[PDB]
């Protein structure tokens, strides 16, 4: 089973990338299973503002690595980020500011949860889906 770990926000980079102090070392995390528009694509600065706002306002940030590979080729940590118990990954998708990404190297624990949310956002024609 997965487990959450504390992290401290250092700097939010964009819709799907955040910089945190993980285990005393600063590190960039790439949010698992989400594809936000590049900051400029339509809805890119909105997804960035959202991610940024969600993490800067949180009293507690926690990271959760999946069962697959924990870093990508650029050295970015691959995880689910929690801001005061709320998973940022899911929050983005539910708000229609991100598409569910293809599973990477066995990291699929929350793909169903995210798929559901995305369906709902499509249904409500939210942002990316309007």
Curated annotation (Swiss-Prot):
The active site is at residues 30, 38, 76. Residues 110-126 have a biased composition (Basic and acidic residues). Residues 110-130 are annotated as: Disordered. It is found in: Secreted. It comes from the Bacteria. Ca(2+) binds at residues 16, 35-36. This is Nuclease A. The gene is nuc.
């Amino acid at each position: 089973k997965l487990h959450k770990e504390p992290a401290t926000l250092i700097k939010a980079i964009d819709g799907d990338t955040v910089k945190l102090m993980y285990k005393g070392q600063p590190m960039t995390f790439r949010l698992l299973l989400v594809d936000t528009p590049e900051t400029v694509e339509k809805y890119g600065p909105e997804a960035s503002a959202f991610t940024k706002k969600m993490v800067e306002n949180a009293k507690k940030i926690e990271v959760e690595f999946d069962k697959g590979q924990r870093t990508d080729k650029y050295g970015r940590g691959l995880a689910y980020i929690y801001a005061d118990g709320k998973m940022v990954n899911e929050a983005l998708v539910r708000q229609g500011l991100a598409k569910v990404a293809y599973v990477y190297k066995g990291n699929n624990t929350h793909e169903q949860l995210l798929r559901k949310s995305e369906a709902q956002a499509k249904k409500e024609k939210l942002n990316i889906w309007s």
